[PDB]
Amino acid sequence: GQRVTISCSGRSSNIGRNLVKWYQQFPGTAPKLLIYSNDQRPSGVPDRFSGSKSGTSASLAVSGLQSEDEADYYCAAWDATLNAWVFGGGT
Amino acid sequence: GQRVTISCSGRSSNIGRNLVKWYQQFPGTAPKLLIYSNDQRPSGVPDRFSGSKSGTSASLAVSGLQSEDEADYYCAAWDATLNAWVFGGGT
Amino acid sequence: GQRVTISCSGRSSNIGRNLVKWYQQFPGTAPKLLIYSNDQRPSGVPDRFSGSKSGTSASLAVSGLQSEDEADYYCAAWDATLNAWVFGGGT
Amino acid sequence: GQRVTISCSGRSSNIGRNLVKWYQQFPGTAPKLLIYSNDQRPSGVPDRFSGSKSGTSASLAVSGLQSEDEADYYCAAWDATLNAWVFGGGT
Amino acid sequence: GQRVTISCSGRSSNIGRNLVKWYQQFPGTAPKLLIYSNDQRPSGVPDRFSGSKSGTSASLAVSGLQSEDEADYYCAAWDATLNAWVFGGGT
């Protein structure tokens, strides 16, 4: 008689009285990007993979006022076996 | 008699009294992008994969005021086996 | 007698008294993109895959005021087996 | 006697008193895109696939005021087997 | 005696007192797109597939004021077997 209880909560999860007050006044933004020559050549060859930001990836992130970037991948299992029983009887 | 209880909550989940007040006043934005030559060549060859942002991918993210980017992939299992029983009787 | 209870909630899920007040006043936006030469060649060859943003993909995301981009893929299972029983009797 | 209860809620799901007040005043937007030469060649060859944004796909997303892009794929199962029983009796 | 209860709710589902107040005043939009040469060649060859945005597809999404794009594919099952019983008796 096995029991497994995985209550793996996520992103802004089971929230009681949450509040996110934001404000932004008077921003002036002029984020430009200019390139004369930029050649990345990122050729990723994985075999077995499970990770979050997999990218062998030469980026260029110019941020002005706001740029929120996350990645969720919850409760994962590449190879899980939570309970087991084996018996042998081969005469 | 096995029991499994996976209450893996997600994104803004089971929320009681949530509130997101936002404001943005007076923004002035001029985000331009110019390229003379930029040739990425990202040729990703995976075999077994489970991860969130898989991309071997040379990007260029110029952000003005706001750019929200997430990725959800919940409660996943590449290979899960939660309960088991085996018996052998081959005479 | 097995029991499985997967209440894997999703996106803005089971919400009690949720509210998203937004505002945006006075934005001025001129996001242009210009390219003289940009040839990505992303030829992804996966075999077994389960992940969220699969794309080996050299993008260029210029964001003005707002650009929200997510991806949901919930409660997934590449190979799951939640309960089992085996018996052998081959004489 | 097995029991399975998968109440995997989705997008804006089971909502009590939800509200999304929005506003946008005074935007001025001129998002143009110009290309002299841009030839992506993304020829993706998968075999077994289950993920959300599958596209090996070099895009160019210029965003003005607003561009919301999600993708839902809920409660999925590449290969699931929730309960089982086996018996053998071959004399 | 098996029981299966999959109440997998969808998009704006089972909603109590939902409201989406929107407003947009004073927008001025001039989103043009011009191309001298852009030849994607995306020839995707999958074999077994179940995912949401399948497209190996180099797009160009210039967004003015608003462009909402989602994709729903709910409660799916590539190969599911929720309950079972087997017995053997071959003398």
Place this chain on the structure above:
Amino acid sequence: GQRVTISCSGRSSNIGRNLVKWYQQFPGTAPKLLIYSNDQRPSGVPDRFSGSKSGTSASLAVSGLQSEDEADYYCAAWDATLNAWVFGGGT
């Protein structure tokens, strides 16, 4: 004695007191598209497929004021078997 109850709700489903107030005042839109040469060649050859936006398809979506695009495909099953019983008696 098996029981299956799949109340998989859909799009704007079972709604109590739903309301979508919209407004849009003063928009001026001039979204043009011009092409000197753009030849996609997307020849997708799938074998077994179940996903939502199947298209290996290099598009160009210029959006002015509003363009809403979704896709619903609910409660699907590539191969589902919800309950079963087998017995053997071949003497």
Place this chain on the structure above:
Amino acid sequence: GQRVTISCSGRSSNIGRNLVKWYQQFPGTAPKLLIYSNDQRPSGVPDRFSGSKSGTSASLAVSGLQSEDEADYYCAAWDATLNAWVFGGGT
């Protein structure tokens, strides 16, 4: 004695007191499209298919004020078998 109850609701379904107030004042729209040469060649050859937007299809969607495009395909089953019983007695 099996029971199956699939109340899979659809699009704007079982609605209590629904309302969609819309307004649009002062739009001026001039969305033109011009092509010097654009030859897609999308020749899709599927074998077994069940998905929503099947089209390997390089489109060009210029949107002015409004263009709503969805696709419904509800409660589907590529191969479903909800209940069963088998017995063997071949002497």
Place this chain on the structure above:
Amino acid sequence: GQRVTISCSGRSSNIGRNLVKWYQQFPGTAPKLLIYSNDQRPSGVPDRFSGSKSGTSASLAVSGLQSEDEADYYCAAWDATLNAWVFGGGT
């Protein structure tokens, strides 16, 4: 009779009375990026991988006012086996 209880909470999880008051007044931002020649060549070849920010990836992150970037990958298991029993009886 085994018991496993993994209540591995996530991001802003199980929150009682959370609040995030923000403010930002008077910012003036002009973050530009210019390149005469910058060619990264990051070609990552992993074999077995499970980590969070996998990218062998020479980036250039110029930040103006705000740029929040995280990555979540929760409760993972490259190879886990939580409980077991083995017996041998082969005469």
